[PDB]
Nucleic acid binder design. Structure first.
Ligand SMILES: [K+]
Ligand SMILES: [K+]
Ligand SMILES: [Mg+2]
Ligand SMILES: [Mg+2]
Ligand SMILES: [Mg+2]
Ligand SMILES: [Mg+2]
Ligand SMILES: [Mg+2]
Ligand SMILES: [Mg+2]
Ligand SMILES: [Mg+2]
Ligand SMILES: [Mg+2]
Ligand SMILES: [Mg+2]
Ligand SMILES: [Mg+2]
Ligand SMILES: [Mg+2]
Ligand SMILES: [Mg+2]
Ligand SMILES: [Mg+2]
Ligand SMILES: [Mg+2]
Lengths: 78, 80, 310
RNA sequence: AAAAAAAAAAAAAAUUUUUUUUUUUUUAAAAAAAAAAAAAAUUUUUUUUAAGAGUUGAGAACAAAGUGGCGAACGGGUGAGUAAGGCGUGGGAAUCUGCCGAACAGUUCGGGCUAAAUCCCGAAGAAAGCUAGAAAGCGCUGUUUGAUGAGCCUGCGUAG
RNA sequence: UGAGACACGGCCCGGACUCCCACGGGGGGCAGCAGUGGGGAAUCUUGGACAAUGGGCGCAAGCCUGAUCCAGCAAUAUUG
RNA sequence: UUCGCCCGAAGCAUCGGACCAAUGAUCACCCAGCACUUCUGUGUAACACUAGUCACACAAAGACUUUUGGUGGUCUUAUU
């Protein structure tokens, strides 16, 4: 039920809550999802991501790296 | 709409006494019905059963079944 | 749509069950059964059965299904009016009406199928017997062989005779007579001696109609001597009670047997069998009169049949 | 409309092929609901209605509205009243105490609220069940306790 | 009702004041945080976040929290 | 601020009728069920020549029992 190949856009679309508007900027500046999983708040603040979206991205990065959460594969057809 | 234990036992001879009932997500466990306490509407009630672990009986005296009105129940046609 | 005895009876029940919350007498249910007249009024009866089952478990604490005779009678009432779908719903193993499937309900359905000449209704009733795990019985075999006699269905004969013989049932004499006489109507000689061998395994002494059919099979081989000896030994071992019946069966020879045995042949075989019977059956009548049998036959009906000029 | 594993190389490409387990059916070993239109020798392709229905198989949200539990007696504000039923300080006996810690025993059966319940009523002895998704994990009840609070009383001290 | 209240943002009744009303009748209580009139010589933003600490509910994930934390205004104070 | 009278909203309390509306206990009565009896009807299996004979279920009745469900009475109204 989860996405097999997970990148930055699948991760951010699985988080939801309007945070998927920063897919293009985070692809341009961070590129790799493994870089995003260890990005902290000052770097995301420099990229123009607001407070609640920053906190959501960091929360689900910590959840994803521990196995506690995976993005669902049902968000494949836009 | 999914069926609870009573709404499955209506399509059963002798009200399902003697048959093995299980929840749909259960894997290797079922209850062998001993008494059904039907309510007025015919869709809800209580149930008493004998628990079977891996097709083998594990208890001597029957007990009241939890979650009878949950809409996830089914009967096993092979164990009964 | 409903008959008025039935609307009133249904209500008095659905009113005792629902409003008074007390069990009605059994007589009201049984009179709702006896007063069904049209097809639409047995949906009322099934609604009554469902409500009485719900009340029996809910108030009386009765888990048991409705008993055997009640299921027999609801099936026979469902088929006496003529609603076969709800009639055959009494054979269902899983139903909300508390109906236990029995051999008797299927016997009612097959009695209707015999009396109304319904060939596929065999296939649904027997598939319902197999599906709802009811055992195969000699009376079921009796009714099945009797109907597939009357419907020109040799495939049903072969399939269900294999099923019954694999099931290990003990076929009665009458169904053996029906089998042998229908194989005489069709002309399968090898199957005729096969079922004769099977019945000789089953019973010892021949009866009238089966020695009759053995004579038919021998006459299909144009060997009237063995046929004459067989009907001689079956005529000696009887008293004079069925003197009209044996004459009626000899009228069956001179009227209906050649037509039935030549409907299933090809045209050159129709010519061959017409010539062979025209050579054998007058010699057969003269042999029977020579042996001492006083049998009244009509030899003009040999040429009065419209089939025997093929 | 079943579970697990692999698919990278020659003569427009998402979903299929192969291997092992498993439920059921069909003819004792193998094989694998109704109607319309078409094709082939009963099966296949497309479409409509399925499913108060011989157990429809999984899934997602249900907040959409509720019943129920717990908390809204804490935290926050102000000093109107109050001259002693208050406060400060020290004691007491005639009490209760959710949540929290630690023992023991139980957790049975009927009915009612359009439907149900850990909601309400009744019987014993008091109770209440959920979860094989949270199956020996929560929860409830009775009895002994610790801890924390609360109620009650009182000596002394406390304006003009 | 509740273990706990005779309960600031619960209920019932009476009173004064006040807002709707389709005119039958309903509704309200900043001495919570901001803020406004008024009185006065005179006393502030209709701010941000639940990141920390504390608290309620939940098994958790979390969700609430003008408690708080932190910014804003004012020589009002401070051995700067 | 206090005292004496008149009135008495909501509410806690106390009575009183009331079998009001439930609940409980106890009486009957009616179906229905479990075991039983049948010279009864309707099925299944042998047999017998088509008639017996067992096995069923009859709910088809019977009648003392006993139970589930109802209905109608009582309780010094017994608990709300
Ligand atoms: K916080
Ligand atoms: K100054
Ligand atoms: Mg409050
Ligand atoms: Mg307070
Ligand atoms: Mg303060
Ligand atoms: Mg102060
Ligand atoms: Mg409380
Ligand atoms: Mg109280
Ligand atoms: Mg307020
Ligand atoms: Mg203020
Ligand atoms: Mg001024
Ligand atoms: Mg906290
Ligand atoms: Mg907790
Ligand atoms: Mg604030
Ligand atoms: Mg200075
Ligand atoms: Mg009053």
């Amino acid at each position: 039920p989860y996405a097999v190949k997970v990148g930055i856009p699948e991760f951010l679309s699985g988080i939801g809550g309007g945070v998927e508007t920063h897919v293009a900027r985070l692809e341009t500046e961070l590129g790799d999802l493994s870089k995003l999983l260890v990005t902290r708040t000052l770097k995301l603040k420099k990229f123009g991501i607001p407070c609640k979206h920053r906190k959501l991205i960091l929360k689900y990065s910590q959840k994803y790296r521990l196995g506690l959460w995976k993005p669902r594969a049902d968000a494949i057809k836009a | 709409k999914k069926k609870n234990l009573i709404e499955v036992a209506q399509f059963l001879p002798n009200w399902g006494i003697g048959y093995h009932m299980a929840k749909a997500h259960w894997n290797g466990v079922s209850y062998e019905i001993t008494k059904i306490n039907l309510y007025k509407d015919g869709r809800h009630g209580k149930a008493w059963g004998i628990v079977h672990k891996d097709g083998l009986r594990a208890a001597e005296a029957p007990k009241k079944i939890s979650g009878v009105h949950k809409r996830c129940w089914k009967y096993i046609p092979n164990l009964s | 749509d409903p008959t008025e005895a039935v609307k009133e009876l249904h209500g008095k029940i659905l009113d005792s069950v629902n409003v008074k919350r007390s069990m009605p007498p059994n007589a009201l249910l049984w009179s709702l059964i006896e007063n069904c007249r049209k097809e639409d009024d047995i949906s009322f009866l099934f609604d009554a059965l469902q409500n009485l089952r719900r009340f029996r478990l809910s108030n009386l604490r009765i888990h048991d299904n409705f008993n055997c005779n009640l299921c027999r009678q609801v099936a026979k009432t469902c088929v006496r009016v003529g609603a076969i779908n709800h009639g055959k719903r009494a054979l269902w193993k899983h139903n909300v009406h508390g109906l236990t499937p029995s051999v008797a309900s299927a016997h009612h359905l097959l009695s209707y199928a015999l009396e109304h000449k319904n060939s596929n209704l065999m296939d649904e009733v027997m598939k319902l017997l197999k599906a709802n795990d009811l055992p195969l019985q000699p009376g079921t075999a009796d009714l099945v062989f009797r109907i597939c006699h009357e419907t020109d269905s040799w495939d049903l004969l072969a399939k269900y005779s294999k099923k019954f013989c694999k099931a290990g049932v003990k076929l009665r004499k009458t169904t053996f007579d029906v089998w042998m006489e229908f194989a005489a109507k069709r002309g399968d000689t090898e199957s005729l001696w096969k079922v004769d061998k099977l019945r000789s395994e089953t019973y010892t002494q021949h009866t009238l109609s089966a020695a009759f059919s053995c004579a038919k099979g021998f006459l299909l081989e144009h060997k009237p001597e063995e046929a004459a000896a067989v009907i001689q030994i079956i005529c000696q071992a009887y008293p004079d009670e069925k003197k009209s019946a044996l004459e009626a069966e000899f009228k069956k020879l001179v009227n209906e047997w050649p037509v039935d045995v030549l409907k299933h042949q090809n045209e050159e075989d129709k010519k061959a069998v017409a010539a062979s019977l025209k050579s054998d059956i007058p010699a057969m009548v003269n042999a029977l009169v020579n042996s001492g049998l006083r049998v009244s036959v009509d030899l003009d009906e040999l040429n009065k049949n419209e089939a025997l000029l093929s």
